[PDB]
Design a protein around this ligand. Structure first.
Ligand SMILES: Nc1nc2c(ncn2[C@@H]2O[C@H](COP(=O)(O)OP(=O)(O)NP(=O)(O)O)[C@@H](O)[C@H]2O)c(=O)[nH]1
Ligand SMILES: [Mg+2]
Lengths: 16, 128, 994, 205
């Protein structure tokens, strides 16, 4: 589940 | 059927900046702080006169309460690029309208410059 | 008109006294202000004590009687032994003869408690002077009188209470060792009779006022009485049962039992052990049945603040933590005592939920004590598994931002608790995270507190368990940020994600792709205009780097270059939106990584590439500001220069010795810049006056000088090649700063110059003896003149001045030997000048320099300079040290004054001063220095303290010189002297105490 | 509805500076030792109405102590002050407390460690435990940075009124009101004020 965690963080942004 | 168990509202906020307010002790040739907190530009909705209201942090005590008269002029201080000096003839922060020479300092030169613009954009309103 | 009673020629108009007294206590304004000044001059009149006879008898104002008891108290305390003997009997009979009457009139006995207490204390002051040598029947007559009147029996408990405090609790500083011992021995010899009266009062009831006042006096006795009075009588059962039931006696009884839990008892008697169990079992039972059950919500009770509930809950926590820290082993083996042990800890659990910072620290200290023991002691942790399980949640939910002292305490307890049960800790934290996700406990404060708790237990789980725990947490946190609406909410959760990630470097090290992703997210967050995000991203970046730097400097599998090169390449765009201070942190972080590269050529190359942007901006400014110095009159140019230097300071801070190549790239032009700036400041002060130093323009210029000095100080403090520091750096530095400092007006002299020079002398001072001489020549006399007119002006210059003289005295003492005799005299003056400062940063250095200078002179042996030094300055140092020891205004430096004095005195009683310290005319030939030292000291003290007898001065000096190889005894003799000068008629035999 | 507050502590711990900050908002940089005592009325505005403290600011230096424990009579609350940069001022705290509670046997008392704004702190937090067995409220404060400067009065107000939920509230601000014979003198006072540099220009505000 380490590769999924990586991509989930790259998708993190503050704006909607 | 079951039974179940500041006098500022009439005003609008033109400008709001955090600042420290100083009063000049002429008999001591010394600046004295009067308060630190939010400086607010308050226009009354039923007279459109813009005032200066400033309260100390925590204790919420008033350290400035006076009309932004169009005759007042903002002059810089010799030791600061983020402060303005001006004389005030009627301030009622501590009771009776007393005359005061005020200095007000801000976090940066930008806020000090923006304050002057808003201070002038308040003397226009109290002219009409 | 109120100034009439100040005229002692007439008689005291008592009616006029009660007016000015009431005008002071109940009045206001100017009428109260001077009336206060009149009462000061009246009370401070040396003859006002004999008028206390009339006031205490004729006045109707209780404040006036109080004030005159004070006037009496000053007399009993300071001049009692000087009085005619019959006056001592008059005052003593009078005071006994008023308390006798205030206790008989029940009206005044309950209306003027202040006045009777003030009279009781006055009596105790007399007892300290007269009892028991001239009053052997006080205690027996006190006991007899108690049996007649309940009001006097209660008041006698107040007298004994104050007596115990004066003798045992507050004597160490206020009386001599001898007089204290005399009084302790006297109380000790007659306590059997005092205890009997106290015990029978507590057993026979029944007046609550009398009982409480007896318990208050028992509290004091427990500080010093032997244990047999507590364990061989029935008093433990009375305290733990009877007196716990009534709320009137409850508070004081609980304090007595707290002190009982600290008694000195023998730990081998199984009978005493059972009494220690018994009174605890009784106390907890009374609490459960008369106050509140163990399930009660102490947090809500404390917040309601009814009556004395807060103080009671505070005393209960103090009682439980004190007892259990000492005695919980007594309850851990016996199966019948297991419920008592776990109920007591369950009250502590409930106490720990109270919202009261200082109370929490009290309970947190106990928990630390407990869990440390469960972690090291065999077979103990299974007893407390349910206590510990609750404690985990209490600590997790009250985690503070990482007071920093409190966070460390919470982290230490929570780390112990995680070792004790890793599985329980993970379940509690994941559950709390779920209650953050479903929104039942969602809050900014709540999510931050949890992240702190999660981050605090880093390095306590196995690496594999940690891996799946971290992944679960980051994933849930990532999902929580995903579901939240708005930048405010998503900034808080993203910050927490970064905090947790930053707290787990072991996990980041083993997963490079994830680590790279984090760092690239931080770089992205450095463009975020939202308040605090840029600050958070920078703080996380440097924190992660300090722990994972090795993984930025090596070439990771899967890639072409160490990630440090990738950071340096994009450094302009990464930082383009940051404030200057944030850019400096970024560069410092890079400097941390670079210092991990131990290939010199590779490290220098990384350094020069990292410094490319500041070096280019530097080269252009040094070009255009040299041609020609008008651009320094631009505020924008001044900021850019200051920011270039700060960048070098930041990188030099993390690289230290490795920074040298970059320092050499700018060094020579920097010092030239220092000169150019220095001229412009001097010019502006010439054109506008001293006020120019307050202008933004000059303050920006002095910032450049300051940053330059800080950069130089930073490299030299960490340098390894001292030879290059001496031969390349020091001389151009001194030419740039010394003369400019010496030849500026005082208001234009930067104290940072002295601080920079201190660093240079500290590091390479032993290698530049002519350099040290040049430093003293340029800064000593001119700085001394700035600071030797008062203790106020130029605070920084003051502290740095003595820091500099201290290091020069330590590392290049020869420079003071080369001073002209007039300059060496100012050096001695300056040291003594530092003695007189109440500023702790000056005074401690001043005393250390004195001590170190005496040692420097001693090590020179029997040579003319050492001989002249003692002839000129030995008694000056003995006199000046004695002055600050005895003037009551330099008490913070007593220990180092004592040390220095003992060194000076021991030099003479060992015969290391070869010269005679006297002129051969004033004292016969062959007279020892020891005999002259005693004569000099006796005369100096006789003139400085004329109220002392010759015998006192001689006995004091005899003990002092004999004890000059025993610091603890020597200091005791000084303290005895400091007491005796406060009064008249001090007993000279007191100095035979040791 | 007024309360007598006695303020005690060693000389130089900042008692007078703390009170002045509450009275006028100023920070007095100079040490001018109090002589005996200096009484000042101090009023706060709460959701339970106004509360007035008659602050008896007593003197710390012994030679200037005046009535000393005579100032404590009929005091209803107290503040004990020490300086976290001066170890001896904390060692004397039990002496001040002993003298105070012998006169005032049951009043709420706040222990204040002043000057926490100074980096080189000598009295560390974990060393400050005296309040525990005496049931004093303790606060780190700084009259210079105003860190926690309102807490000692807020806590005492809550104890003296008997309401744990009492809070400071903004008092109402009435409208402010609106000759050439003073134009020359107000301009005289202005030009000196402009050429007097404002203090503490390195501070963040
Ligand atoms: N850095 C700093 N200095 C403070 C602070 N509070 C007071 N001071 C300084 O401490 C010094 C003592 O001032 P003062 O208020 O008169 O102390 P005091 O306890 O009233 N003296 P006394 O008891 O003898 O009357 C002053 O110079 C003041 O500027 C503070 O919070 N921070
Ligand atoms: Mg004072």
């Amino acid at each position: 589940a380490l590769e999924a965690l990586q991509k989930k963080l790259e998708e993190l942004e503050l704006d909607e | 059927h079951f039974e179940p168990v500041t006098m500022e509202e009439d005003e609008e906020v033109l400008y709001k900046v955090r600042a420290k307010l100083f009063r000049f002790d002429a008999d001591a040739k010394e600046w004295k702080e009067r308060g630190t907190g939010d400086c607010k530009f308050l226009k009354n909705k039923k007279t459109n006169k813009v005032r200066i209201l400033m309260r100390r942090d925590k204790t919420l005590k008033i350290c400035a309460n006076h009309i932004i008269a169009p005759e007042y002029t903002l002059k810089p201080n010799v030791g600061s690029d983020r402060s303005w000096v001006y004389a005030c003839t009627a301030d009622i922060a501590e009771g009776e309208a007393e005359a005061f020479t005020f200095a007000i300092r801000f976090g940066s030169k930008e806020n000090a410059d923006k304050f002057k613009e808003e201070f002038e954009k308040a003397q226009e309103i109290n002219k009409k | 008109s109120m100034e009439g009673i100040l005229d002692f020629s007439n008689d005291l108009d008592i009616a006029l006294l009660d007016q000015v007294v009431s005008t002071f206590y109940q009045g206001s304004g100017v009428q109260q202000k001077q009336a206060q000044e009149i009462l000061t001059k009246f009370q401070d009149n040396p003859d006002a004590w004999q008028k206390a006879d009339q006031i205490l008898q004729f006045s109707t104002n209780p404040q006036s009687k109080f004030i005159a008891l004070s006037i009496l108290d000053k007399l009993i305390t300071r001049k009692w032994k000087l009085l005619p003997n019959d006056h001592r009997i008059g005052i003593r009979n009078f005071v006994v003869g008023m308390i006798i009457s205030m206790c008989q009139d029940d009206e005044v006995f309950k209306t003027q408690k202040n006045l009777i207490n003030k009279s009781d204390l006055t009596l105790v002051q007399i007892l300290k002077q007269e009892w028991p040598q001239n009053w052997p029947e006080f205690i027996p007559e006190l006991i007899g009188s108690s049996s007649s009147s309940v009001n006097v029996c209660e008041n006698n408990m107040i007298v004994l209470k104050l007596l115990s405090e004066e003798v045992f609790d507050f004597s160490a500083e206020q009386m001599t060792q001898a007089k204290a011992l005399h009084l302790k021995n006297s109380m000790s010899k007659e306590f059997e009779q005092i205890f009997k009266l106290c015990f029978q009062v507590l057993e026979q009831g029944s007046s609550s006022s009398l009982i409480v006042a007896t318990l208050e006096s028992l509290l004091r006795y427990l500080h010093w009485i032997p244990y047999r009075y507590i364990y061989e009588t029935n008093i433990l059962e009375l305290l733990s049962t009877k007196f716990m039931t009534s709320p009137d006696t409850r508070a004081i009884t609980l304090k007595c039992l707290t002190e009982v839990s600290n008694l000195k008892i023998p730990q081998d008697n199984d009978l005493i052990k059972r009494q220690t169990v018994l009174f605890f079992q009784n106390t907890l039972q009374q609490i459960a049945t008369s106050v509140m059950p163990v399930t009660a919500d102490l947090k809500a009770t404390y917040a309601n603040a009814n009556g004395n509930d807060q103080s009671f809950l505070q005393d209960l926590a103090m009682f439980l933590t004190t007892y259990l820290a000492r005695n919980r082993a007594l309850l851990e083996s016996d199966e019948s005592l297991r419920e008592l042990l776990l109920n007591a800890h369950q009250y502590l659990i409930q106490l720990s939920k109270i919202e009261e910072r200082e109370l929490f620290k009290t309970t947190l200290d106990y928990w630390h004590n407990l869990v440390a023991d469960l972690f090291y002691e065999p077979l103990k942790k299974h007893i407390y598994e349910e206590i510990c399980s609750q404690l985990r949640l209490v600590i997790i939910e009250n985690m503070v931002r990482p007071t920093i002292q409190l966070y460390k305490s919470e982290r230490e307890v929570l780390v112990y608790l995680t070792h004790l049960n890793v599985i329980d800790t993970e379940e509690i934290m994941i559950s709390k995270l779920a209650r953050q996700i479903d929104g039942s406990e969602w809050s900014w404060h709540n999510i931050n507190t949890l992240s702190w708790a999660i981050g605090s237990i880093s390095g306590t789980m196995s690496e594999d368990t940690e891996k799946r725990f971290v992944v679960t947490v980051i994933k849930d946190l990532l999902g929580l940020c995903e579901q939240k609406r708005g930048k405010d909410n998503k900034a808080v959760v993203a910050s927490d994600i970064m905090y947790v990630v930053g707290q787990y470097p072991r996990f980041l090290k083993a997963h490079w792709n994830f680590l790279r992703t984090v760092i690239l997210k931080l770089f992205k967050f450095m463009h975020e205009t939202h308040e605090g995000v840029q600050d958070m991203a920078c703080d996380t970046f440097i924190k992660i780097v300090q722990k994972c730097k090795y993984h930025f400097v090596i070439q990771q599998p899967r890639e072409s270059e160490p990630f440090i090169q990738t950071i340096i390449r994009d450094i302009q765009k990464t930082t383009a939106d940051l404030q200057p201070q944030q850019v400096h942190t970024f560069y410092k972080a890079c400097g941390i990584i670079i210092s991990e590269e131990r290939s010199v050529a590779e490290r220098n190359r990384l350094l020069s590439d990292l410094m490319q942007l500041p070096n280019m901006a530097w080269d252009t400014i040094v070009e255009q500001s040299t041609a020609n110095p008008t651009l320094l009159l631009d505020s924008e140019t001044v900021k850019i220069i200051a920011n270039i230097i700060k960048t070098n300071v930041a990188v030099c801070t993390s690289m230290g010795a490795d920074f040298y190549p970059q320092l050499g790239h700018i060094y020579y032009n920097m010092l030239q810049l220092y000169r150019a700036v220095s001229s412009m400041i001097s010019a502006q002060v010439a054109a506008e006056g001293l006020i120019a130093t307050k202008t933004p323009k000059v303050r920006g210029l002095r910032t450049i000088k300051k940053e330059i000095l800080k950069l130089v100080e930073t490299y030299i403090s960490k340098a390894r090649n001292l030879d290059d520091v001496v031969k390349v750096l020091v001389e151009p530095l001194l030419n740039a700063v010394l003369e400019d400092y010496m030849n500026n007006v005082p208001d234009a002299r930067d104290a940072e110059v002295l601080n920079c020079m201190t660093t240079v002398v500290e590091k390479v001072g032993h290698m530049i003896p002519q350099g040290v001489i040049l430093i003293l020549q340029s800064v000593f006399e001119c700085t001394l003149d700035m600071i030797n007119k008062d203790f106020t002006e130029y605070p920084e210059h003051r502290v740095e001045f003595y820091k500099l003289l201290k290091v020069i005295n330590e590392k290049s003492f020869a420079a003071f030997l080369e001073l002209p005799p007039a300059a060496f005299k100012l050096f001695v003056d300056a040291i003594c000048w530092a003695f007189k400062h109440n500023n702790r940063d000056v005074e401690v250095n001043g005393l250390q320099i004195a001590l170190d200078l005496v040692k420097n002179i001693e090590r020179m042996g029997n040579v003319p300079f050492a001989n002249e030094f003692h002839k000129n300055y030995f008694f000056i140092f003995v006199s000046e040290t004695f002055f600050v020891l005895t003037d009551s205004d330099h008490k913070s430096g007593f220990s180092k004054q004592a040390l220095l004095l003992m060194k000076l005195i021991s030099l003479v009683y060992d015969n290391k001063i070869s010269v005679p310290l006297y002129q051969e005319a004033e004292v016969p030939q062959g007279t020892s220095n020891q005999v002259y030292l005693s004569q000099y000291l006796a005369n100096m003290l006789s003139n400085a303290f004329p109220h002392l007898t010759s015998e006192q001065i001689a006995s004091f000096l005899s003990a002092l010189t004999k004890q000059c190889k025993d610091l603890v005894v020597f200091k005791g003799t000084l303290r005895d002297f400091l007491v005796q000068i406060k009064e008249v008629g001090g007993d000279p035999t007191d100095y035979l105490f040791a | 509805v007024q309360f007598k507050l006695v303020l005690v502590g060693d000389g130089g711990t900042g008692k007078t500076t703390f009170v002045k900050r509450h009275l006028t908002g100023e920070f007095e940089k100079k040490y001018v030792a109090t002589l005996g005592v200096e009484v000042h009325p101090l009023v706060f505005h709460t959701n339970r109405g106004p509360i007035k403290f008659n602050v008896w600011d007593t003197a710390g230096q012994e030679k200037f102590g005046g009535l000393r424990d005579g100032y404590y009579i009929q005091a209803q609350c107290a503040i004990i002050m020490f300086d976290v940069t001066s170890r001896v001022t904390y060692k004397n705290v039990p002496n001040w407390h002993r003298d105070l509670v012998r006169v005032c046997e049951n009043i709420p008392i706040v222990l204040c460690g002043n000057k926490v704004d100074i980096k080189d702190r000598k009295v560390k937090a974990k060393s400050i435990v005296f309040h525990r067995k005496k049931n004093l409220q303790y606060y780190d404060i700084s009259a210079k940075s105003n860190y926690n400067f309102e807490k000692p009065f807020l806590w005492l107000a809550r104890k003296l009124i008997g309401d744990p939920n009492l809070e400071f509230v903004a008092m109402p601000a009435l409208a402010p009101p609106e000759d050439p014979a003073l134009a020359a003198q107000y301009e005289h006072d202005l030009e000196v004020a402009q050429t007097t540099a404002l203090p503490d220009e390195d501070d963040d505000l």
